[PDB]
Amino acid sequence: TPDCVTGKVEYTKYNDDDTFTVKVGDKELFTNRWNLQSLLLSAQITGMTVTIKTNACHNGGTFSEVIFR
Amino acid sequence: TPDCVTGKVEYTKYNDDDTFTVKVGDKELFTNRWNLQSLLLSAQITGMTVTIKTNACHNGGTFSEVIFR
Amino acid sequence: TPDCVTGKVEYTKYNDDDTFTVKVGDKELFTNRWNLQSLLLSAQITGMTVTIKTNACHNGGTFSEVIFR
Amino acid sequence: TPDCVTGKVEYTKYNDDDTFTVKVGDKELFTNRWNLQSLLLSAQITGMTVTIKTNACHNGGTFSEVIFR
Amino acid sequence: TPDCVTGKVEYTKYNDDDTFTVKVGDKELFTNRWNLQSLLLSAQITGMTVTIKTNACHNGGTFSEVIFR
């Protein structure tokens, strides 16, 4: 899967349908993997750099691969 | 869903029916999504600013959408 | 449910039977709600003030309502 | 259950069979309760003092009761 | 099980099939044990030194034993 965006988590959002949204770089992407929620919040809180890998690299895109640096 | 309140979590409460209550701004709101409990406590401990989005924007109101900034 | 004790978490104990015990004020109380284990440990580690609400307000008493400040 | 060892967590080990091993004092003890893994790691990371209670108070001994302070 | 690599966690990666990848030393290894994900991220965030024990000691290798110091 190709890299989509890399950077710090600007904000996260829990959604009504139980998905989780993250804002990295200039993209707002969401995921439906439950384990990623607390992991992504930890990344946000501790200010790590993350790379999101996805084919749907656009606002509203979904993803399920993340690299925590 | 519209913004209801934005600010720091003053306090949280675990309820007998397992729902979770949060006090942000001047509203006391609750949620029945189990994943939000630890996330909201982290938000509280680390002092993040959160925005709660809900139609039931009033004390005793319920919610399931949150933005962590 | 009435207030029972308020204060910092003196210590916590994971029990053989999988219940969780907390020492706040002069009472030692236990709960069987899982989600409360990690939440209570976080409260302990970060030095939060908690209020436990329960009718069984006595050593060995059970509880399932907690307020985290 | 009697006290076995008290002190800081010197190290923890995740084992191939999903049990968790902890080194406190001069004993190396393991547990099969899944909830205790993250709790014990938090204890280790934050440098808490823990007391492990068990009858198998010897290297290779098992346990399921822990006091966190 | 023999030691494979020891060092801090360079980065971690959540994979689409819900396995978790970690980069320690010069090896990139992955695990399918769900409990290790948050534990490894904590290790990464807090900069602990970990030792991964495995027979598949090579890039792409799996593992399920970890020592956190």
PDB file of N, CA, C and O in Angstrom, chain E:
ATOM      1  N   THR E   1      13.521 -20.035  23.673  1.00  0.00           N
ATOM      2  CA  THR E   1      13.630 -19.296  22.382  1.00  0.00           C
ATOM      3  C   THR E   1      14.826 -18.358  22.460  1.00  0.00           C
ATOM      4  O   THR E   1      15.024 -17.659  23.457  1.00  0.00           O
ATOM      5  N   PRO E   2      15.644 -18.330  21.399  1.00  0.00           N
ATOM      6  CA  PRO E   2      16.835 -17.474  21.361  1.00  0.00           C
ATOM      7  C   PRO E   2      16.589 -15.990  21.157  1.00  0.00           C
ATOM      8  O   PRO E   2      15.597 -15.588  20.545  1.00  0.00           O
ATOM      9  N   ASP E   3      17.505 -15.177  21.676  1.00  0.00           N
ATOM     10  CA  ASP E   3      17.432 -13.737  21.491  1.00  0.00           C
ATOM     11  C   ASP E   3      17.631 -13.480  20.010  1.00  0.00           C
ATOM     12  O   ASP E   3      18.389 -14.187  19.341  1.00  0.00           O
ATOM     13  N   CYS E   4      16.929 -12.479  19.496  1.00  0.00           N
ATOM     14  CA  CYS E   4      17.053 -12.118  18.094  1.00  0.00           C
ATOM     15  C   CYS E   4      17.623 -10.706  17.970  1.00  0.00           C
ATOM     16  O   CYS E   4      18.663 -10.497  17.332  1.00  0.00           O
ATOM     17  N   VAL E   5      16.949  -9.742  18.587  1.00  0.00           N
ATOM     18  CA  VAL E   5      17.425  -8.364  18.597  1.00  0.00           C
ATOM     19  C   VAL E   5      17.071  -7.652  19.899  1.00  0.00           C
ATOM     20  O   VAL E   5      16.082  -7.980  20.551  1.00  0.00           O
ATOM     21  N   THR E   6      17.896  -6.682  20.273  1.00  0.00           N
ATOM     22  CA  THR E   6      17.680  -5.889  21.469  1.00  0.00           C
ATOM     23  C   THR E   6      17.950  -4.433  21.120  1.00  0.00           C
ATOM     24  O   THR E   6      18.895  -4.121  20.389  1.00  0.00           O
ATOM     25  N   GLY E   7      17.099  -3.546  21.627  1.00  0.00           N
ATOM     26  CA  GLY E   7      17.255  -2.128  21.362  1.00  0.00           C
ATOM     27  C   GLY E   7      15.937  -1.404  21.547  1.00  0.00           C
ATOM     28  O   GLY E   7      14.952  -2.016  21.961  1.00  0.00           O
ATOM     29  N   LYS E   8      15.908  -0.105  21.273  1.00  0.00           N
ATOM     30  CA  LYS E   8      14.654   0.629  21.379  1.00  0.00           C
ATOM     31  C   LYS E   8      13.837   0.354  20.124  1.00  0.00           C
ATOM     32  O   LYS E   8      14.371  -0.173  19.148  1.00  0.00           O
ATOM     33  N   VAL E   9      12.544   0.677  20.160  1.00  0.00           N
ATOM     34  CA  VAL E   9      11.642   0.470  19.028  1.00  0.00           C
ATOM     35  C   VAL E   9      11.742   1.647  18.079  1.00  0.00           C
ATOM     36  O   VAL E   9      11.347   2.762  18.425  1.00  0.00           O
ATOM     37  N   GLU E  10      12.275   1.393  16.886  1.00  0.00           N
ATOM     38  CA  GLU E  10      12.485   2.454  15.911  1.00  0.00           C
ATOM     39  C   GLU E  10      11.126   2.970  15.438  1.00  0.00           C
ATOM     40  O   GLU E  10      10.862   4.173  15.449  1.00  0.00           O
ATOM     41  N   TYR E  11      10.271   2.050  15.023  1.00  0.00           N
ATOM     42  CA  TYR E  11       8.908   2.383  14.627  1.00  0.00           C
ATOM     43  C   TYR E  11       8.051   1.135  14.690  1.00  0.00           C
ATOM     44  O   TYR E  11       8.566   0.021  14.786  1.00  0.00           O
ATOM     45  N   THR E  12       6.740   1.333  14.654  1.00  0.00           N
ATOM     46  CA  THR E  12       5.785   0.233  14.679  1.00  0.00           C
ATOM     47  C   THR E  12       4.810   0.457  13.544  1.00  0.00           C
ATOM     48  O   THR E  12       4.645   1.584  13.076  1.00  0.00           O
ATOM     49  N   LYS E  13       4.169  -0.615  13.099  1.00  0.00           N
ATOM     50  CA  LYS E  13       3.241  -0.518  11.997  1.00  0.00           C
ATOM     51  C   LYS E  13       2.048  -1.444  12.211  1.00  0.00           C
ATOM     52  O   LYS E  13       2.207  -2.631  12.515  1.00  0.00           O
ATOM     53  N   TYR E  14       0.848  -0.902  12.070  1.00  0.00           N
ATOM     54  CA  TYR E  14      -0.333  -1.730  12.145  1.00  0.00           C
ATOM     55  C   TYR E  14      -0.594  -2.145  10.697  1.00  0.00           C
ATOM     56  O   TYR E  14      -0.559  -1.310   9.798  1.00  0.00           O
ATOM     57  N   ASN E  15      -0.827  -3.437  10.474  1.00  0.00           N
ATOM     58  CA  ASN E  15      -1.007  -3.961   9.126  1.00  0.00           C
ATOM     59  C   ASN E  15      -2.471  -4.290   8.865  1.00  0.00           C
ATOM     60  O   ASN E  15      -3.218  -4.591   9.780  1.00  0.00           O
ATOM     61  N   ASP E  16      -2.886  -4.249   7.613  1.00  0.00           N
ATOM     62  CA  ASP E  16      -4.278  -4.487   7.309  1.00  0.00           C
ATOM     63  C   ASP E  16      -4.878  -5.782   7.859  1.00  0.00           C
ATOM     64  O   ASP E  16      -6.073  -5.828   8.156  1.00  0.00           O
ATOM     65  N   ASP E  17      -4.076  -6.832   8.003  1.00  0.00           N
ATOM     66  CA  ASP E  17      -4.612  -8.099   8.494  1.00  0.00           C
ATOM     67  C   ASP E  17      -4.556  -8.155  10.007  1.00  0.00           C
ATOM     68  O   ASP E  17      -4.644  -9.223  10.619  1.00  0.00           O
ATOM     69  N   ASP E  18      -4.399  -6.985  10.605  1.00  0.00           N
ATOM     70  CA  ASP E  18      -4.372  -6.844  12.047  1.00  0.00           C
ATOM     71  C   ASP E  18      -3.162  -7.482  12.735  1.00  0.00           C
ATOM     72  O   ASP E  18      -3.224  -7.786  13.927  1.00  0.00           O
ATOM     73  N   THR E  19      -2.069  -7.688  11.994  1.00  0.00           N
ATOM     74  CA  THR E  19      -0.815  -8.075  12.634  1.00  0.00           C
ATOM     75  C   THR E  19      -0.081  -6.769  12.960  1.00  0.00           C
ATOM     76  O   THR E  19      -0.443  -5.689  12.490  1.00  0.00           O
ATOM     77  N   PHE E  20       0.958  -6.858  13.765  1.00  0.00           N
ATOM     78  CA  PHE E  20       1.648  -5.654  14.170  1.00  0.00           C
ATOM     79  C   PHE E  20       3.120  -5.850  13.853  1.00  0.00           C
ATOM     80  O   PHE E  20       3.690  -6.900  14.144  1.00  0.00           O
ATOM     81  N   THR E  21       3.730  -4.837  13.251  1.00  0.00           N
ATOM     82  CA  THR E  21       5.127  -4.903  12.859  1.00  0.00           C
ATOM     83  C   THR E  21       5.963  -3.962  13.695  1.00  0.00           C
ATOM     84  O   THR E  21       5.536  -2.855  14.006  1.00  0.00           O
ATOM     85  N   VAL E  22       7.154  -4.407  14.068  1.00  0.00           N
ATOM     86  CA  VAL E  22       8.033  -3.588  14.883  1.00  0.00           C
ATOM     87  C   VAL E  22       9.433  -3.601  14.274  1.00  0.00           C
ATOM     88  O   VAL E  22       9.851  -4.585  13.680  1.00  0.00           O
ATOM     89  N   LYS E  23      10.141  -2.493  14.424  1.00  0.00           N
ATOM     90  CA  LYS E  23      11.486  -2.362  13.906  1.00  0.00           C
ATOM     91  C   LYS E  23      12.423  -2.127  15.080  1.00  0.00           C
ATOM     92  O   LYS E  23      12.395  -1.065  15.717  1.00  0.00           O
ATOM     93  N   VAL E  24      13.228  -3.139  15.381  1.00  0.00           N
ATOM     94  CA  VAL E  24      14.188  -3.061  16.474  1.00  0.00           C
ATOM     95  C   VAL E  24      15.522  -3.486  15.890  1.00  0.00           C
ATOM     96  O   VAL E  24      15.583  -4.460  15.145  1.00  0.00           O
ATOM     97  N   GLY E  25      16.588  -2.762  16.226  1.00  0.00           N
ATOM     98  CA  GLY E  25      17.881  -3.062  15.644  1.00  0.00           C
ATOM     99  C   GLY E  25      17.814  -2.939  14.130  1.00  0.00           C
ATOM    100  O   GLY E  25      17.403  -1.900  13.598  1.00  0.00           O
ATOM    101  N   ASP E  26      18.189  -4.010  13.433  1.00  0.00           N
ATOM    102  CA  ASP E  26      18.190  -4.020  11.974  1.00  0.00           C
ATOM    103  C   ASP E  26      17.121  -4.954  11.412  1.00  0.00           C
ATOM    104  O   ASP E  26      17.051  -5.176  10.206  1.00  0.00           O
ATOM    105  N   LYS E  27      16.294  -5.508  12.284  1.00  0.00           N
ATOM    106  CA  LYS E  27      15.247  -6.418  11.837  1.00  0.00           C
ATOM    107  C   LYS E  27      13.881  -5.778  11.894  1.00  0.00           C
ATOM    108  O   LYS E  27      13.602  -4.921  12.732  1.00  0.00           O
ATOM    109  N   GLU E  28      13.031  -6.215  10.980  1.00  0.00           N
ATOM    110  CA  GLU E  28      11.639  -5.818  10.970  1.00  0.00           C
ATOM    111  C   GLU E  28      10.877  -7.130  11.159  1.00  0.00           C
ATOM    112  O   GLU E  28      10.928  -8.016  10.306  1.00  0.00           O
ATOM    113  N   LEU E  29      10.186  -7.249  12.292  1.00  0.00           N
ATOM    114  CA  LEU E  29       9.485  -8.475  12.651  1.00  0.00           C
ATOM    115  C   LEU E  29       8.025  -8.172  12.929  1.00  0.00           C
ATOM    116  O   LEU E  29       7.681  -7.032  13.246  1.00  0.00           O
ATOM    117  N   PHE E  30       7.164  -9.178  12.797  1.00  0.00           N
ATOM    118  CA  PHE E  30       5.750  -8.940  13.059  1.00  0.00           C
ATOM    119  C   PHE E  30       5.160 -10.007  13.977  1.00  0.00           C
ATOM    120  O   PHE E  30       5.703 -11.104  14.107  1.00  0.00           O
ATOM    121  N   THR E  31       4.067  -9.660  14.649  1.00  0.00           N
ATOM    122  CA  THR E  31       3.419 -10.578  15.574  1.00  0.00           C
ATOM    123  C   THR E  31       1.913 -10.552  15.341  1.00  0.00           C
ATOM    124  O   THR E  31       1.378  -9.560  14.846  1.00  0.00           O
ATOM    125  N   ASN E  32       1.242 -11.643  15.699  1.00  0.00           N
ATOM    126  CA  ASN E  32      -0.197 -11.734  15.517  1.00  0.00           C
ATOM    127  C   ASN E  32      -0.920 -11.791  16.869  1.00  0.00           C
ATOM    128  O   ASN E  32      -2.134 -12.008  16.921  1.00  0.00           O
ATOM    129  N   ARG E  33      -0.177 -11.590  17.958  1.00  0.00           N
ATOM    130  CA  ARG E  33      -0.791 -11.548  19.292  1.00  0.00           C
ATOM    131  C   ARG E  33      -1.325 -10.126  19.522  1.00  0.00           C
ATOM    132  O   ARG E  33      -0.563  -9.163  19.579  1.00  0.00           O
ATOM    133  N   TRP E  34      -2.639 -10.001  19.638  1.00  0.00           N
ATOM    134  CA  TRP E  34      -3.297  -8.707  19.813  1.00  0.00           C
ATOM    135  C   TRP E  34      -2.904  -7.903  21.069  1.00  0.00           C
ATOM    136  O   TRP E  34      -2.901  -6.673  21.029  1.00  0.00           O
ATOM    137  N   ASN E  35      -2.557  -8.579  22.163  1.00  0.00           N
ATOM    138  CA  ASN E  35      -2.185  -7.881  23.400  1.00  0.00           C
ATOM    139  C   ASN E  35      -0.866  -7.120  23.262  1.00  0.00           C
ATOM    140  O   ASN E  35      -0.630  -6.114  23.942  1.00  0.00           O
ATOM    141  N   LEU E  36       0.013  -7.612  22.396  1.00  0.00           N
ATOM    142  CA  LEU E  36       1.318  -6.984  22.237  1.00  0.00           C
ATOM    143  C   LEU E  36       1.332  -5.619  21.558  1.00  0.00           C
ATOM    144  O   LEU E  36       2.309  -4.878  21.671  1.00  0.00           O
ATOM    145  N   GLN E  37       0.259  -5.284  20.853  1.00  0.00           N
ATOM    146  CA  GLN E  37       0.202  -4.024  20.133  1.00  0.00           C
ATOM    147  C   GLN E  37       0.318  -2.803  21.039  1.00  0.00           C
ATOM    148  O   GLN E  37       1.229  -1.985  20.863  1.00  0.00           O
ATOM    149  N   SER E  38      -0.584  -2.665  22.010  1.00  0.00           N
ATOM    150  CA  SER E  38      -0.527  -1.511  22.903  1.00  0.00           C
ATOM    151  C   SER E  38       0.729  -1.570  23.778  1.00  0.00           C
ATOM    152  O   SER E  38       1.330  -0.529  24.091  1.00  0.00           O
ATOM    153  N   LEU E  39       1.135  -2.783  24.158  1.00  0.00           N
ATOM    154  CA  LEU E  39       2.323  -2.939  24.992  1.00  0.00           C
ATOM    155  C   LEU E  39       3.554  -2.441  24.245  1.00  0.00           C
ATOM    156  O   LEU E  39       4.376  -1.703  24.790  1.00  0.00           O
ATOM    157  N   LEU E  40       3.676  -2.841  22.987  1.00  0.00           N
ATOM    158  CA  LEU E  40       4.792  -2.402  22.170  1.00  0.00           C
ATOM    159  C   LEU E  40       4.768  -0.907  21.882  1.00  0.00           C
ATOM    160  O   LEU E  40       5.824  -0.275  21.807  1.00  0.00           O
ATOM    161  N   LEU E  41       3.575  -0.326  21.723  1.00  0.00           N
ATOM    162  CA  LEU E  41       3.495   1.102  21.467  1.00  0.00           C
ATOM    163  C   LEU E  41       3.913   1.849  22.729  1.00  0.00           C
ATOM    164  O   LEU E  41       4.589   2.868  22.659  1.00  0.00           O
ATOM    165  N   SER E  42       3.512   1.350  23.893  1.00  0.00           N
ATOM    166  CA  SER E  42       3.922   1.976  25.137  1.00  0.00           C
ATOM    167  C   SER E  42       5.447   1.936  25.239  1.00  0.00           C
ATOM    168  O   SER E  42       6.094   2.935  25.593  1.00  0.00           O
ATOM    169  N   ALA E  43       6.014   0.770  24.942  1.00  0.00           N
ATOM    170  CA  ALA E  43       7.454   0.595  24.960  1.00  0.00           C
ATOM    171  C   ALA E  43       8.093   1.650  24.046  1.00  0.00           C
ATOM    172  O   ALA E  43       9.070   2.302  24.418  1.00  0.00           O
ATOM    173  N   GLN E  44       7.522   1.825  22.857  1.00  0.00           N
ATOM    174  CA  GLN E  44       8.042   2.797  21.914  1.00  0.00           C
ATOM    175  C   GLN E  44       7.942   4.215  22.460  1.00  0.00           C
ATOM    176  O   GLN E  44       8.928   4.940  22.518  1.00  0.00           O
ATOM    177  N   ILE E  45       6.750   4.622  22.860  1.00  0.00           N
ATOM    178  CA  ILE E  45       6.568   5.964  23.368  1.00  0.00           C
ATOM    179  C   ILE E  45       7.478   6.289  24.555  1.00  0.00           C
ATOM    180  O   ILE E  45       8.041   7.375  24.638  1.00  0.00           O
ATOM    181  N   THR E  46       7.629   5.349  25.472  1.00  0.00           N
ATOM    182  CA  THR E  46       8.415   5.601  26.668  1.00  0.00           C
ATOM    183  C   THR E  46       9.889   5.288  26.500  1.00  0.00           C
ATOM    184  O   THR E  46      10.674   5.451  27.435  1.00  0.00           O
ATOM    185  N   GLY E  47      10.260   4.842  25.308  1.00  0.00           N
ATOM    186  CA  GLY E  47      11.651   4.531  25.034  1.00  0.00           C
ATOM    187  C   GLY E  47      12.292   3.428  25.869  1.00  0.00           C
ATOM    188  O   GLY E  47      13.450   3.549  26.289  1.00  0.00           O
ATOM    189  N   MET E  48      11.568   2.341  26.119  1.00  0.00           N
ATOM    190  CA  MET E  48      12.149   1.230  26.861  1.00  0.00           C
ATOM    191  C   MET E  48      13.014   0.451  25.877  1.00  0.00           C
ATOM    192  O   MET E  48      12.918   0.630  24.660  1.00  0.00           O
ATOM    193  N   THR E  49      13.871  -0.404  26.414  1.00  0.00           N
ATOM    194  CA  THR E  49      14.694  -1.281  25.598  1.00  0.00           C
ATOM    195  C   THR E  49      13.960  -2.615  25.604  1.00  0.00           C
ATOM    196  O   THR E  49      13.531  -3.083  26.667  1.00  0.00           O
ATOM    197  N   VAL E  50      13.795  -3.215  24.429  1.00  0.00           N
ATOM    198  CA  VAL E  50      13.130  -4.508  24.353  1.00  0.00           C
ATOM    199  C   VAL E  50      14.022  -5.540  23.675  1.00  0.00           C
ATOM    200  O   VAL E  50      14.883  -5.202  22.857  1.00  0.00           O
ATOM    201  N   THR E  51      13.820  -6.794  24.047  1.00  0.00           N
ATOM    202  CA  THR E  51      14.516  -7.900  23.426  1.00  0.00           C
ATOM    203  C   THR E  51      13.435  -8.779  22.848  1.00  0.00           C
ATOM    204  O   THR E  51      12.485  -9.159  23.532  1.00  0.00           O
ATOM    205  N   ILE E  52      13.568  -9.086  21.570  1.00  0.00           N
ATOM    206  CA  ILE E  52      12.608  -9.945  20.922  1.00  0.00           C
ATOM    207  C   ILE E  52      13.274 -11.307  20.778  1.00  0.00           C
ATOM    208  O   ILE E  52      14.427 -11.402  20.353  1.00  0.00           O
ATOM    209  N   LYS E  53      12.555 -12.348  21.189  1.00  0.00           N
ATOM    210  CA  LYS E  53      13.063 -13.704  21.113  1.00  0.00           C
ATOM    211  C   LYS E  53      12.268 -14.442  20.063  1.00  0.00           C
ATOM    212  O   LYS E  53      11.031 -14.471  20.102  1.00  0.00           O
ATOM    213  N   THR E  54      12.982 -15.007  19.099  1.00  0.00           N
ATOM    214  CA  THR E  54      12.340 -15.761  18.031  1.00  0.00           C
ATOM    215  C   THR E  54      13.340 -16.569  17.210  1.00  0.00           C
ATOM    216  O   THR E  54      14.531 -16.234  17.135  1.00  0.00           O
ATOM    217  N   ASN E  55      12.822 -17.646  16.615  1.00  0.00           N
ATOM    218  CA  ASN E  55      13.575 -18.539  15.741  1.00  0.00           C
ATOM    219  C   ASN E  55      13.622 -17.961  14.335  1.00  0.00           C
ATOM    220  O   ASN E  55      14.587 -18.173  13.600  1.00  0.00           O
ATOM    221  N   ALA E  56      12.567 -17.251  13.957  1.00  0.00           N
ATOM    222  CA  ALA E  56      12.513 -16.596  12.657  1.00  0.00           C
ATOM    223  C   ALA E  56      13.220 -15.256  12.777  1.00  0.00           C
ATOM    224  O   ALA E  56      12.614 -14.215  12.532  1.00  0.00           O
ATOM    225  N   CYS E  57      14.494 -15.275  13.154  1.00  0.00           N
ATOM    226  CA  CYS E  57      15.229 -14.027  13.325  1.00  0.00           C
ATOM    227  C   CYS E  57      15.735 -13.450  11.997  1.00  0.00           C
ATOM    228  O   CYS E  57      16.920 -13.542  11.662  1.00  0.00           O
ATOM    229  N   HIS E  58      14.829 -12.831  11.250  1.00  0.00           N
ATOM    230  CA  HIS E  58      15.161 -12.254   9.951  1.00  0.00           C
ATOM    231  C   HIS E  58      14.012 -11.344   9.554  1.00  0.00           C
ATOM    232  O   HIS E  58      12.888 -11.511  10.048  1.00  0.00           O
ATOM    233  N   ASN E  59      14.286 -10.381   8.678  1.00  0.00           N
ATOM    234  CA  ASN E  59      13.232  -9.496   8.192  1.00  0.00           C
ATOM    235  C   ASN E  59      12.035 -10.301   7.702  1.00  0.00           C
ATOM    236  O   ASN E  59      12.174 -11.241   6.921  1.00  0.00           O
ATOM    237  N   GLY E  60      10.854  -9.917   8.169  1.00  0.00           N
ATOM    238  CA  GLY E  60       9.645 -10.627   7.799  1.00  0.00           C
ATOM    239  C   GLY E  60       9.342 -11.724   8.799  1.00  0.00           C
ATOM    240  O   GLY E  60       8.290 -12.374   8.725  1.00  0.00           O
ATOM    241  N   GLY E  61      10.258 -11.929   9.743  1.00  0.00           N
ATOM    242  CA  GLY E  61      10.065 -12.953  10.755  1.00  0.00           C
ATOM    243  C   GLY E  61       8.938 -12.668  11.739  1.00  0.00           C
ATOM    244  O   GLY E  61       8.606 -11.513  11.999  1.00  0.00           O
ATOM    245  N   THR E  62       8.326 -13.723  12.265  1.00  0.00           N
ATOM    246  CA  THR E  62       7.269 -13.552  13.250  1.00  0.00           C
ATOM    247  C   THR E  62       7.910 -13.666  14.630  1.00  0.00           C
ATOM    248  O   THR E  62       9.091 -14.020  14.749  1.00  0.00           O
ATOM    249  N   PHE E  63       7.138 -13.339  15.665  1.00  0.00           N
ATOM    250  CA  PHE E  63       7.600 -13.460  17.046  1.00  0.00           C
ATOM    251  C   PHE E  63       6.418 -13.335  17.990  1.00  0.00           C
ATOM    252  O   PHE E  63       5.353 -12.824  17.623  1.00  0.00           O
ATOM    253  N   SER E  64       6.603 -13.830  19.205  1.00  0.00           N
ATOM    254  CA  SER E  64       5.568 -13.769  20.221  1.00  0.00           C
ATOM    255  C   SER E  64       6.152 -13.719  21.635  1.00  0.00           C
ATOM    256  O   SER E  64       5.430 -13.886  22.615  1.00  0.00           O
ATOM    257  N   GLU E  65       7.458 -13.484  21.735  1.00  0.00           N
ATOM    258  CA  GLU E  65       8.126 -13.340  23.021  1.00  0.00           C
ATOM    259  C   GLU E  65       8.903 -12.040  23.046  1.00  0.00           C
ATOM    260  O   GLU E  65       9.704 -11.759  22.140  1.00  0.00           O
ATOM    261  N   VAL E  66       8.668 -11.245  24.089  1.00  0.00           N
ATOM    262  CA  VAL E  66       9.307  -9.943  24.211  1.00  0.00           C
ATOM    263  C   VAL E  66       9.670  -9.678  25.654  1.00  0.00           C
ATOM    264  O   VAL E  66       8.925 -10.033  26.571  1.00  0.00           O
ATOM    265  N   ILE E  67      10.816  -9.044  25.852  1.00  0.00           N
ATOM    266  CA  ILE E  67      11.253  -8.678  27.188  1.00  0.00           C
ATOM    267  C   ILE E  67      11.310  -7.158  27.225  1.00  0.00           C
ATOM    268  O   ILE E  67      11.934  -6.530  26.362  1.00  0.00           O
ATOM    269  N   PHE E  68      10.647  -6.569  28.215  1.00  0.00           N
ATOM    270  CA  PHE E  68      10.644  -5.120  28.348  1.00  0.00           C
ATOM    271  C   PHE E  68      11.502  -4.703  29.535  1.00  0.00           C
ATOM    272  O   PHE E  68      11.234  -5.103  30.665  1.00  0.00           O
ATOM    273  N   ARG E  69      12.535  -3.906  29.296  1.00  0.00           N
ATOM    274  CA  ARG E  69      13.343  -3.431  30.410  1.00  0.00           C
ATOM    275  C   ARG E  69      13.247  -1.921  30.418  1.00  0.00           C
ATOM    276  O   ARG E  69      13.330  -1.338  29.318  1.00  0.00           O
TER     277      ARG E  69
END
